[PDB]
Design a protein around this nucleic acid. Structure first.
Ligand SMILES: [Mg+2]
Ligand SMILES: [Mg+2]
Ligand SMILES: [Mg+2]
Ligand SMILES: [Mg+2]
Ligand SMILES: [Mg+2]
Ligand SMILES: [Mg+2]
Ligand SMILES: [Mg+2]
Ligand SMILES: [Mg+2]
Ligand SMILES: [Mg+2]
Ligand SMILES: [Mg+2]
Ligand SMILES: [Mg+2]
Ligand SMILES: [Mg+2]
Ligand SMILES: [Mg+2]
Ligand SMILES: [Mg+2]
Ligand SMILES: [Mg+2]
Ligand SMILES: [Mg+2]
Ligand SMILES: [Mg+2]
Lengths: 103, 186, 125, 52, 134, 52, 147, 118
RNA sequence: AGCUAAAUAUUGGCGAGAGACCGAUAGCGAACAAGUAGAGUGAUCGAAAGAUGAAAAGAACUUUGAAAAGAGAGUUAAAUAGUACGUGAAAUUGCUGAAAGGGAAGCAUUGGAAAUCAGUCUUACCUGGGUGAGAUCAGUAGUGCGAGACUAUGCAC
RNA sequence: UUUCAAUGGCCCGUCUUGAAACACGGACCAAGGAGUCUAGCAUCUAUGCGAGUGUUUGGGUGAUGAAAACCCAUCCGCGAAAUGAAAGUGAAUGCAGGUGGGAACGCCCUUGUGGCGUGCACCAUCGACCGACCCGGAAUGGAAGGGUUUGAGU
RNA sequence: GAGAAGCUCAGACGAGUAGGCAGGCGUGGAGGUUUGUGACGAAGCCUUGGGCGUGAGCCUGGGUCGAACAGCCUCUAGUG
RNA sequence: AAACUUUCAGCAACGGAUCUCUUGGCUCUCGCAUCGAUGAAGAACGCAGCGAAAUGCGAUACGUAAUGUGAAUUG
C-alpha cells in the first residue's frame, strides 16, 4: 500500500500491455533500408533532384507565425504570376497546391 | 559486564572521497599532508571538503564571488577566493570585475570571462603553492539548500513545503485539505 | 576474415552442411592433393578422388603404402585402397578406410570427363 | 588537432567541442609536497615510527 | 614535457601486465617489471613510474645485467630509454662493488643499492654449478 | 526472460568524447602501453608516427 | 547488476527480509492507491493534502498555442544579443540604439525583474509588464510592440 | 614465522551433518527459531567467530614458517627469488610431469622450498 | 457516388545472416522413426528416450555346460571402452579388512591406546686450518676541464 | 583417524507468549527449485556539462564488411517565474536590506575557553518586493495609499 | 621503502530474534591481461594422505579418467 | 570365540549424477509474396530385390521425360 515519499502512482498498466509491446531492435535495420531506398530512387530519377522544390509558408498560430518553413505546393496564383501553367508545373517538378491561397 | 551506553560511537563523517577520480586522489594526497604538517584550520577545511559528495558541494557563480568580495566593509579587495566545488558563470553580470579564484572546476564560460576581465583561475594545487596555509584567502561555499529536494523536505500539515506532484494546476492537490471551501486548509 | 553476407561462419550450419551433404557434393569434399610431378604436369593442385586412381598414403599407420582406389565410400567420407586391410578375428581381411585429404594422387584415372575437368580447372593435358 | 581541438580552441570536426580541463594543474604531487614553498612552512616532521 | 609519475602509479597500481596479485595469505602482490629490483608492488620501486630506476636480471651463462633508465629526455623514446650494462665474469666482491658504484656513488638510486646487491647475490647463487647428490 | 529488457546504454556525448580523449592521451604514455601488455620495448618513439 | 543486489545477501536468511510474523503476502492493504479516504487517510491527509475533490472551472478543448507566452526578465535582455553587438553599444554613445527582438529569442512577454545598464535599447516584444517598461524608459530605451 | 600457535585445529562442522547425508559438512549459520546451537546451549557444537582468528604475524604460515605459493610454471617460481625465506613453492596439480621436473630444478637453483616435491 | 503508389504492420509461410541465450530434468511437447507410443465414446490429453571406439578391429579357436553362459585365448592406445558399451557421483548392496557393541545411535571436551603423517636439519654466507695450481690484487700510467662510479690496454708478479 | 573412559549434549524446520512435545512438514539420495524484468516515483552516491542540459524521431560518412563506432540540422522535453477558479497581473527603498549565532582569514594582546574586524553555509528572526484576497478610494484602466491575512513565490 | 589503499603507537569494548548496513567466499557467460595449464593427461570423480583460512571456501599427494581448462582487472546473470 | 548389528576403506554391484560434447531449441535481424473446381489443405490405400516407422512417389508408383554433373549405391 501507499506509504513511501513521492508522487502518488499513476501507472497505466491494467490492460494486457505485454501483448502489445513494441521494441526497436530493427531501428538500425530500418535506417539502412530507408537510406538504400533513397539511393535506389536517386539513381532512378537522375539527373532530376531527389526532392521537389517547395514553397515557403508561415506556420499558423502565434507560437510559430514568426518562423518560415517548407509548404506543400505553390498556389495557382503563384504559378500564374511566375508564368508556369499548372499542367506543366508537375512535369518539371513543381508541386501545385490548389488549397493554399495568397492572403 | 559493564554498563556503557554508546550513542556517538562510530564517527559519521567521510574519511576519504567516494569518487574514483585519480586526480582528486592526488589533491587529497596533497591536502592530507598539508592539513597534518601545518596548524592551519584552512587546510583541514579543504581536506574535509575534498571528501564531500556533489550535493554537499554546491556550485557558486562569479556573481556571488564578485558580490561577496566587494562589500562596503570588505577589505577583500585583492584576495584569492577559494571554493571546493564548481565556479559557474552568471550571464546577468554583464561586466565581470578582476577576480582571483581557486576552484575544483570552472565552467568554460566562467573561466573565459574571468580571464578576459584580467583575473586569474587556479586549481587547488596552484592555491597550495601560493597560500600554503590559506592566508589572506576568502574561503566560500555555495548554497547547500538551494537544490530541489529542500523544497520538499519536512512536508506536513502547516509546514508550507512543496508536495510531490506529477503535474501542476487545478485538479492536482488543490482541493479538500488545501482550502477552507473544501473541508479544511492543510 | 570473411565479408560476404552470403557466407556463414556458423559452426552449426557448416557442420550440418558437411555431414548432410548429398552424394554429388561429397565428391568435391573428398579431394586429394596431386603429387609434385602431377601438379607441374597438369597445373592443378588437387582433384576429387576417383575409383581406379593411384595414391600413396601420407598420414596414419598406413603412411607410405600405395595402391589403386578400389572404392569411394562417400556415405562415410572414406577411401578403400587396394591391399590396405587388417585381419579380423576369423582370419578374413577387412579393408581400412582412409580420408581423401590424407593421400596424394600419383597417377590419375584419366578419361574423357577427367580430361575435360583438367582443362576446365585451368590445367593442361 | 582538427579532430579534438584544444581546451581554448574549438575542434574543427566536432562543433562547439573543447577538450576538458583537469582539476589539478600539476599532477606531480610528490614534487609539490617536497617543494621549497611547502617544506619551508611546515612543522618539524615528527617520528615516522615510535618506540613502545 | 611529462605525464606525472604519480598519475601513472594511480593507473597501474592494480592493473598492469607485470603485477602478479593473488588473494591468498590475505592479498599478496608481486611486481615483475624488468626495472624493479625489489620485486614488490609499490610506487617507489616501480620502474614504470620513476624517472630513475634500476633492475638486475640474469645474464646467460654467468653474471647479471644491470638495467637502468636513461635521462628523462628519452621518456617518449623507449628504444633509448633503457640502458643495459652486462656485469659478468666478475667475482661476487667485484660485481657488488660495481653495482654500488653505478647506482649509489653516482647518486642515481642510492635507496636501491642494498636491494640491488641482494638481487645480484641471489642470481649469482642460482647460477653456480649443482653439486648433485647421487 | 523478455526481449524488452534494456540492452543498450546511453552515455552523454560529451562523456563519450572525454573517454576517447583520455584513451588517446593514455596511448601517448609508454608506461601505460607496457602496463597494458604491449611489447613496445624497442619502438623508437611514442606516439609512433609513420610516413603517409 | 544482480551481483551487487541485496537479494544475493539474503540467500540463507529464510524470510528474505520480510519478517516471520507479518510476511510478504499479496496486497494486504489493497491495490494501487485505493483507500485514500478510508484506511489510507492518515497518509493522504499528511503527504498529499488537496487530493480529493474539485476546484475551479472546466475548459473544454484547451489548445495551448494561443496561450504561448514564455517570459524573460530585464536582467537577461542584454544576454539575448550577440557578443559583438554588446561590445559595440553597451556602455558607448551611439546615434543608433540596438534592437532586441525578444520574440525571435522565443519570448512573448518582457518582465521587470532585475536592472538594466544605462544605454539606450529598443525592446520589441508582444507584451511587457508595467515595471519592465518603466525601467527600460529610465535607461533611455523604448518598448515597441509587435505581433 | 616464529612460534606458530593455532587457536583451534578442529574444523567447525555443520550441525546435524553427522546425521543426514544430504547435509554437507561445510559450515552454515543455524537460523532456526528454536536452534540450541545458535543459542549456544552447553554441550552443543561451537560456531565460528572472529575471536578464533589467529595471530596476524603467524596467520597463513605452514608449520615451517613459510607460506605455500602456488606455481604453474618456471616463471611463477622465479617470482620467489628475493622471497626465499617467506614463501614456499606449491606446484599445481594440473602441471605436467615434464614441466614439474623443470619447476623442481628451478626452485632448487633458487633455494625455494617446494611443499609437494615428488 | 468512386480510385489511388510510398513512408506503416507482420509470434503464419518461404529464404538468409546472427547472438554476452539453453546445453538432454535445460532449450520448442519433440536434439532420438514426436504431435510418435499410450489414454479417452468424444471434445481432447500426450510422454519417456542423445554419447563403444580413430576404425567393429563387435572377441577366431580350445575347453566346461542341455543351454544362457563361464574359463582360456584374441582385438584395441584402453575391455578400469564388450554394444546391459565415454566419464561413471549419491542413495542402496555383496565380499574382504579394521574396530566397537548389557533396552537406540549420533555429537562436544580431554587424554590413553593403536594406526598413520611431517621434520632432511648441521643446507646458504663468513672466517680459520691442510695441500694444490693459476690469464694475479690495493696505489697508480694513459686513453669527458674541476670531484665521484664503471669497463677496457699494461704495470704492480 | 578410530575407539575407550570421565563430563556435558532432547529433533531439526515452523507458526508461537511459550516446542523435546501426545502441534504440523520431514523414510533415503541425486538433479531442479522461489524478490525477477519493465513503466514510474523518492532519497542517497558517482560522472559529464552548467543557466543551461539532452547526438540515437531522423539524417550522414555507407560501399566496401558495418545492428557498433563516429559525425550532423530543426524541433521538442525538463530547467531559467510566480500566482489565481479565471479574466489576468507578474518580482531591488537599501551593499539585493537589518538582527543573532557562525566556517575560513586578518589584526591585537599576552599565555586563557583569548579580545577586535570582516563575515561563507545553515538556522531563527524584523522588513522589502510579485500574485491572490480583504479594504478605504480621491464608459473604461487601476495608478498612489493600506491590511490582522494568503501562495508549492522574489 | 614498506600497495600513503602504506607504515607506526595507544586505549576502551565484544548477547542477539525480526530487521538494517558493510566486507568477503562460491557458480554460468562477456571484454582485457597472464612467451597462463593441458594427451609427457584438461575437466570431472574417489580417497582409509598433507597444507591454509574464524568461516564461506581454497591449495596439494595418491587413485580413476580422456579434451579441454584456469589466475588477475573489469562486465554480466536463469548465480549457492 | 563366532554369528549378528553398526561405521569406515578397498574391490565388486546397483543407479545414472558430474564433466566434456551438440546436424537441436530459443531469440534477434535481413529478404521475399506463391493455395484451391486446371480439384487445395487434410484424410485413406498402395508403390522398392530383400522395407515396418520417416523421406519420396502414385498402377508410368523410393518414380517417366528434360537439364547438369560425371562413377557410384552400399546392410
Ligand atoms: Mg516465512
Ligand atoms: Mg498480526
Ligand atoms: Mg583449522
Ligand atoms: Mg581409458
Ligand atoms: Mg545430560
Ligand atoms: Mg515472536
Ligand atoms: Mg521447535
Ligand atoms: Mg499450531
Ligand atoms: Mg498447520
Ligand atoms: Mg509426516
Ligand atoms: Mg541443486
Ligand atoms: Mg555480536
Ligand atoms: Mg546461464
Ligand atoms: Mg586430471
Ligand atoms: Mg567417504
Ligand atoms: Mg587457522
Ligand atoms: Mg534461480
Amino acid at each position: 500500500a501507499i506509504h513511501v515519499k513521492g508522487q502518488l502512482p499513476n501507472a497505466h498498466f491494467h490492460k494486457d500491455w505485454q501483448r502489445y509491446v513494441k521494441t526497436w531492435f530493427n531501428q538500425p535495420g530500418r535506417k539502412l533500408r530507408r537510406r538504400q531506398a533513397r539511393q535506389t530512387k536517386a539513381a532512378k530519377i537522375a539527373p532530376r533532384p531527389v526532392e521537389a522544390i517547395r514553397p515557403a509558408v508561415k506556420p499558423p498560430t502565434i507560437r510559430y507565425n514568426m518562423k518560415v518553413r517548407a509548404g506543400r505546393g505553390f498556389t495557382l496564383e503563384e504559378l500564374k504570376a511566375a508564368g508556369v501553367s499548372r499542367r506543366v508545373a508537375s512535369t518539371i517538378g513543381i508541386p501545385v497546391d490548389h488549397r493554399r491561397r495568397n492572403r | 559486564g559493564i554498563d556503557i551506553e554508546r550513542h556517538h560511537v562510530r564517527k559519521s563523517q567521510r574519511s576519504k572521497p567516494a569518487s574514483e577520480n585519480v586526480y582528486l586522489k592526488l589533491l587529497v594526497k596533497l591536502y592530507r599532508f598539508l592539513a597534518r604538517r601545518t596548524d592551519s584550520r584552512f587546510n583541514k577545511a579543504i581536506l574535509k571538503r575534498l571528501f564531500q559528495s556533489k550535493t554537499n558541494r554546491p556550485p557558486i557563480s562569479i556573481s556571488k564571488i564578485a558580490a561577496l568580495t566587494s562589500r562596503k566593509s570588505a577589505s577583500l579587495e585583492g584576495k584569492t577566493t577559494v571554493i571546493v566545488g564548481t565556479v559557474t558563470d552568471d550571464e546577468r553580470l554583464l561586466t565581470v570585475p578582476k577576480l582571483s579564484v581557486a576552484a575544483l572546476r570552472f565552467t568554460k564560460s566562467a573561466r573565459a570571462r574571468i580571464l578576459k576581465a584580467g583575473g586569474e583561475v587556479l586549481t587547488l594545487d596552484q592555491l597550495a603553492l601560493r597560500a600554503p596555509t590559506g592566508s589572506n584567502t576568502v574561503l566560500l561555499r555555495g548554497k547547500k539548500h538551494a537544490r530541489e529536494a529542500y523544497r520538499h523536505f519536512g512536508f506536513g500539515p502547516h509546514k508550507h513545503k512543496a508536495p510531490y506532484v506529477r503535474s501542476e494546476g487545478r485538479k492536482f492537490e488543490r482541493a479538500r485539505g488545501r482550502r477552507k471551501s473544501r473541508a479544511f486548509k492543510v | 576474415m570473411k565479408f560476404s553476407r552470403d557466407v556463414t561462419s556458423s559452426r552449426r550450419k557448416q557442420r550440418k552442411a558437411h555431414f548432410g551433404a548429398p552424394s554429388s557434393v561429397r565428391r568435391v569434399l573428398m579431394s586429394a592433393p596431386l603429387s609434385k610431378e602431377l601438379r607441374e604436369q597438369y597445373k592443378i593442385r588437387s582433384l576429387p578422388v576417383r575409383r581406379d586412381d593411384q595414391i600413396t598414403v601420407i598420414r596414419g599407420s598406413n603412411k607410405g603404402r600405395e595402391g589403386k582406389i578400389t572404392s569411394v565410400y562417400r556415405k562415410k567420407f572414406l577411401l578403400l585402397i587396394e591391399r590396405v586391410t587388417r585381419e579380423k578375428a576369423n582370419g578374413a581381411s577387412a579393408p581400412v578406410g582412409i580420408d581423401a585429404s590424407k593421400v596424394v594422387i600419383t597417377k590419375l584415372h584419366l578419361d574423357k570427363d577427367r580430361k575435360d575437368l583438367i582443362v576446365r580447372k585451368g590445367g593442361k593435358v | 588537432d582538427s579532430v579534438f581541438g584544444s581546451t581554448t580552441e574549438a575542434a574543427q570536426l566536432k562543433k562547439n567541442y573543447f577538450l576538458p580541463e583537469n582539476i589539478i594543474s600539476n599532477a606531480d604531487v610528490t614534487r609539490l609536497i617536497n617543494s621549497d614553498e611547502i617544506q619551508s612552512i611546515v612543522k618539524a616532521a615528527g617520528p615516522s615510527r615510535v618506540k613502545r | 614535457m611529462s605525464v606525472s609519475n604519480d598519475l601513472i602509479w594511480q593507473v597501474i597500481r592494480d592493473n598492469n601486465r607485470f603485477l602478479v596479485k593473488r588473494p591468498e595469505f590475505g592479498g599478496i602482490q608481486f611486481n615483475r617489471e624488468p626495472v624493479n629490483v625489489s620485486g614488490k608492488n609499490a610506487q617507489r620501486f616501480s620502474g614504470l613510474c620513476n624517472d630513475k630506476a634500476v633492475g638486475v636480471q640474469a645474464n646467460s651463462p654467468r653474471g647479471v645485467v644491470l638495467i637502468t633508465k636513461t635521462n628523462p629526455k628519452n621518456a617518449q623514446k623507449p628504444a633509448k630509454l633503457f640502458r643495459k650494462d652486462v656485469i659478468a665474469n666478475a667475482s661476487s666482491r667485484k660485481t657488488y662493488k660495481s653495482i654500488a658504484g653505478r647506482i649509489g656513488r653516482t647518486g642515481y638510486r642510492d635507496d636501491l643499492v642494498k636491494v640491488s646487491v641482494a638481487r645480484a647475490s641471489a642470481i649469482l647463487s642460482s647460477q653456480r654449478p649443482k653439486k648433485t647428490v647421487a | 526472460t523478455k526481449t524488452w529488457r534494456k540492452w543498450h546504454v546511453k552515455v552523454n556525448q560529451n562523456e563519450k568524447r572525454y573517454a576517447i580523449s583520455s584513451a588517446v592521451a593514455a596511448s601517448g604514455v609508454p608506461s601505460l602501453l607496457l602496463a597494458r601488455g604491449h611489447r613496445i620495448e624497442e619502438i623508437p618513439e611514442v606516439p609512433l608516427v609513420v610516413d603517409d | 547488476p544482480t551481483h551487487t543486489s541485496k537479494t544475493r545477501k539474503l540467500r540463507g536468511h529464510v524470510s528474505a527480509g520480510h519478517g516471520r510474523i507479518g510476511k510478504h503476502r499479496k496486497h494486504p492493504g489493497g491495490r494501487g492507491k485505493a483507500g485514500g479516504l478510508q484506511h489510507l487517510r492518515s497518509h493522504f491527509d499528511k503527504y498529499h493534502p488537496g487530493y480529493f475533490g474539485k476546484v475551479g472551472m472546466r475548459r473544454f478543448h484547451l489548445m495551448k498555442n494561443p496561450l504561448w507566452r514564455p517570459t524573460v526578465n530585464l536582467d537577461r535582455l542584454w544576454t539575448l544579443v550577440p557578443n559583438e553587438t554588446r561590445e559595440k553599444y553597451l556602455g558607448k554613445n551611439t546615434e543608433v540604439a540596438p534592437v532586441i527582438n525578444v520574440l525571435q529569442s522565443g519570448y512573448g512577454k518582457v518582465l521587470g525583474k532585475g536592472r538594466l545598464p544605462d544605454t539606450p535599447v529598443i525592446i520589441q516584444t508582444r507584451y511587457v509588464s508595467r515595471r519592465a517598461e518603466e525601467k527600460i524608459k529610465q535607461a533611455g530605451g523604448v518598448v515597441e510592440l509587435i505581433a | 614465522a616464529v612460534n606458530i600457535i593455532k587457536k583451534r585445529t578442529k574444523p567447525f562442522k555443520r550441525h546435524q551433518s553427522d546425521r543426514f547425508k544430504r547435509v554437507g559438512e561445510s559450515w552454515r549459520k543455524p537460523r532456526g527459531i528454536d536452534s540450541c546451537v545458535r543459542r549456544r546451549f552447553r554441550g552443543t557444537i561451537s560456531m565460528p567467530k572472529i575471536g578464533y582468528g589467529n595471530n596476524k604475524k603467524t596467520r597463513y604460515c605452514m608449520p615451517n614458517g613459510l607460506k605455500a605459493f602456488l606455481v604453474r610454471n618456471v616463471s611463477d617460481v622465479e617470482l620467489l627469488l628475493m622471497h626465499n625465506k617467506t614463501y614456499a613453492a606449491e606446484i599445481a596439480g594440473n602441471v605436467s610431469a615434464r614441466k614439474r621436473v623443470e619447476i623442481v630444478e628451478k626452485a632448487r637453483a633458487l633455494g625455494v622450498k617446494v611443499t609437494n616435491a615428488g
